[PDB]
Amino acid sequence: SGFRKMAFPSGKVEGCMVQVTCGTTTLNGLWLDDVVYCPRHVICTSEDMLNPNYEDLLIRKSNHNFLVQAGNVQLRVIGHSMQNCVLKLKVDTANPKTPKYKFVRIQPGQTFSVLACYNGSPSGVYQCAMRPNFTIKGSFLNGSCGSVGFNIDYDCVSFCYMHHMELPTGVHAGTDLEGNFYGPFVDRQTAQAAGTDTTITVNVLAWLYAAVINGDRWFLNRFTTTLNDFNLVAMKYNYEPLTQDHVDILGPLSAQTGIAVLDMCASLKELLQNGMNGRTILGSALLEDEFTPFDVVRQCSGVT
Amino acid sequence: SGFRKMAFPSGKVEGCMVQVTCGTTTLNGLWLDDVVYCPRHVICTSEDMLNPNYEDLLIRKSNHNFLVQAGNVQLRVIGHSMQNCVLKLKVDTANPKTPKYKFVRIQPGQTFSVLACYNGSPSGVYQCAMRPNFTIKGSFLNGSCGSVGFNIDYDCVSFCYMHHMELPTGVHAGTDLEGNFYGPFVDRQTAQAAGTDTTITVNVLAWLYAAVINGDRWFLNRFTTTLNDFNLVAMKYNYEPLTQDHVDILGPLSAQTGIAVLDMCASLKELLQNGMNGRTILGSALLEDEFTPFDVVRQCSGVT
Numbered sequence: 001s002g003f004r005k006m007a008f009p010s011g012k013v014e015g016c017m018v019q020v021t022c023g024t025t026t027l028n029g030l031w032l033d034d035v036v037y038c039p040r041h042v043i044c045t046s047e048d049m050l051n052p053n054y055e056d057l058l059i060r061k062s063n064h065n066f067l068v069q070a071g072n073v074q075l076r077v078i079g080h081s082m083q084n085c086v087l088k089l090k091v092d093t094a095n096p097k098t099p100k101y102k103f104v105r106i107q108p109g110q111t112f113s114v115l116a117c118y119n120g121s122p123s124g125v126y127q128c129a130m131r132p133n134f135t136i137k138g139s140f141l142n143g144s145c146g147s148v149g150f151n152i153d154y155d156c157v158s159f160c161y162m163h164h165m166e167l168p169t170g171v172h173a174g175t176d177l178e179g180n181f182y183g184p185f186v187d188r189q190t191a192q193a194a195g196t197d198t199t200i201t202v203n204v205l206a207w208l209y210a211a212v213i214n215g216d217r218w219f220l221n222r223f224t225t226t227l228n229d230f231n232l233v234a235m236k237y238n239y240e241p242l243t244q245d246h247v248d249i250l251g252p253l254s255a256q257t258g259i260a261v262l263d264m265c266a267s268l269k270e271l272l273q274n275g276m277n278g279r280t281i282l283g284s285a286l287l288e289d290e291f292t293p294f295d296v297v298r299q300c301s302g303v304t
Numbered sequence: 305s306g307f308r309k310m311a312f313p314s315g316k317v318e319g320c321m322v323q324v325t326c327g328t329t330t331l332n333g334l335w336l337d338d339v340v341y342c343p344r345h346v347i348c349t350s351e352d353m354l355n356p357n358y359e360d361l362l363i364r365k366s367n368h369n370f371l372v373q374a375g376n377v378q379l380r381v382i383g384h385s386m387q388n389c390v391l392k393l394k395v396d397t398a399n400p401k402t403p404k405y406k407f408v409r410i411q412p413g414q415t416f417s418v419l420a421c422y423n424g425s426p427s428g429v430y431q432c433a434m435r436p437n438f439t440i441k442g443s444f445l446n447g448s449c450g451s452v453g454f455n456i457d458y459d460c461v462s463f464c465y466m467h468h469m470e471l472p473t474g475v476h477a478g479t480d481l482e483g484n485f486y487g488p489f490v491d492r493q494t495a496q497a498a499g500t501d502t503t504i505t506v507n508v509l510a511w512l513y514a515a516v517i518n519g520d521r522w523f524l525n526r527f528t529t530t531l532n533d534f535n536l537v538a539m540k541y542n543y544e545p546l547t548q549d550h551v552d553i554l555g556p557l558s559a560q561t562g563i564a565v566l567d568m569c570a571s572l573k574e575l576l577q578n579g580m581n582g583r584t585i586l587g588s589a590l591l592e593d594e595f596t597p598f599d600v601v602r603q604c605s606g607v608t
């Protein structure tokens with residue numbers, strides 16, 4: 001009973017957090033095996049984030065300029081390289097707490113947990129999603145750079161995000177663990193506006209299924225729709241277009257509740273057209289889109 | 305930038321989760337030093353949760369009937385005792401992963417993180433609050449019993465909650481780590497209705513301060529109120545009465561923003577009287593009450 005915005009247990013990732021200092025800039029690194037991953041802007045001063053030439057700035061840095069501290073003990077840096085917008089710091093010691101891991105690049109609409117860190121130390125964990133405009137709506141102050149986003153499948157941590165930047169609009173931009181930014185963002189102190197933040201339609205439907213499973217059924221109606229009819233309404237409300245792939249992924253939720261995906265689309269169509277009318281669904285007064293269909297099944301079944 | 309429902313990093317608590325089996329019932333235990341804490345209903349069959357006499361049921365149980373497994377290794381039970389609604393299982397081995405810890409009994413309005421577990425294994429972490437009716441709005445399926453609620457101050461885990469029961473209304477009831485239930489709930493399969501779920505006024509005000517700090521200011525008005533005037537409105541909307549202790553605790557948030565607590569009370573009074581009018585505050589279309597003033601400061605300052 002109950003449905004919550006739930007993050008993955010963060011222990012496996014906590015054992016990987018380290019502090020990286022270069023010059024006067026300090027941020028977080030991720031220590032997996034004998035490599036520490038961190039944003040390449042650790043080599044910049046605030047006075048040079050305006051137009052950095054990372055390759056030129058890196059020439060003035062040696063292994064001994066990267067101060068890596070895991071807890072209260074210093075790691076010896078024996079190599080360094082830049083891969084896209086991340087630095088890979090080869091250290092002389094393999095992290096004994098390295099979990100089974102993968103580096104994955106996620107698609108918009110996919111959710112992940114963030115272990116927010118400052119000075120290599122974890123402050124909190126929250127669940128968020130890669131927005132359709134490739135931003136994330138996080139909670140990150142200065143110094144949170146290098147904090148990572150991840151998913152867990154039994155004992156394997158799939159790292160998908162590394163935090164780099166806050167846009168002037170208070171939304172967040174970062175890279176996958178290969179250093180490639182999600183979206184068109186660059187690691188520069190220049191105005192970069194985000195595109196339309198559309199709603200993740202398949203996730204809203206998954207969350208409506210979760211609501212039915214937990215007793216919130218007031219929004220269920222006597223109607224049905226088609227993918228093309230639904231999508232006309234989705235376009236009008238800045239919702240992502242629903243495809244047959246999305247319908248397929250909602251299959252298990254549809255099978256569990258006995259509510260056809262297109263009937264749930266009609267319920268969502270009425271919610272968009274009429275609003276909530278002062279009512280709530282799973283404690284929310286707006287349509288939640290940061291639960292994937294997989295998250296709903298996982299939480300509703302008790303996967304560990 | 306950004307404000308999220310954030311849980312504490314769960315690693316310290318993950319290292320304490322074990323599985324406890326008695327007969328055919330399996331739930332979670334908390335292993336701290338050489339003692340495993342778990343709900344006493346682990347000794348019950350579903351056929352006897354209707355009217356259990358725990359003292360009589362416990363007479364038929366010996367140390368060897370409590371199967372305690374930490375990961376894939378079995379702990380030897382050398383003693384057992386019942387303290388209120390929890391069982392304390394003395395094991396022959398101190399948990400090497402025991403963090404610095406305390407057992408605290410929280411007041412309504414206070415928030416904590418829950419590490420939801422099944423079969424001694426963590427599934428997720430979420431932030432919730434002790435409701436004014438002494439229930440919690442969690443996410444707990446059968447077998448989640450023994451999952452714990454906690455807070456962390458640097459390296460010390462203060463355990464405040466152990467999950468025991470779901471009420472027929474889908475809300476949750478549990479105990480502190482001394483086995484005393486929060487509220488009037490008993491560990492029996494009998495209908496127990498919760499009281500009025502009032503809104504935690506001081507937490508809503510703290511969250512309104514967090515919204516101002518992060519840029520959401522549309523709700524700020526030209527008005528002020530008094531504690532007695534505000535409380536008349538709070539009574540009408542099932543909000544907890546605001547006291548001078550609550551005003552005092554909001555002092556640092558008032559000092560940071562330059563917004564007098566009573567002026568913020570007037571903003572909240574208008575929000576209650578007029579609603580949101582289709583608008584949102586920190587991504588929410590309702591007034592959030594599960595952030596304490598301490599949570600807002602901690603998150604807004606980056607405490608680790």
Ligand SMILES: O=C(Cc1cccc(Cl)c1)Nc1cn[nH]c1
Pocket residue numbers: 041049140141142143144145164165166167186187188189190305
């Ligand atoms: O955004 C930054 C620094 C920065 C400026 C410009 C570009 C880059 Cl890569 C990084 N600080 C931040 C605090 N919280 N989240 C991010």
Ligand SMILES: O=C(Cc1cccc(Cl)c1)Nc1cn[nH]c1
Pocket residue numbers: 001345353444445446447448449468469470471490491492493494
């Ligand atoms: O509530 C229970 C079992 C129970 C019944 C009656 C009393 C007691 Cl103590 C415990 N199952 C549950 C699943 N999720 N959360 C709780």
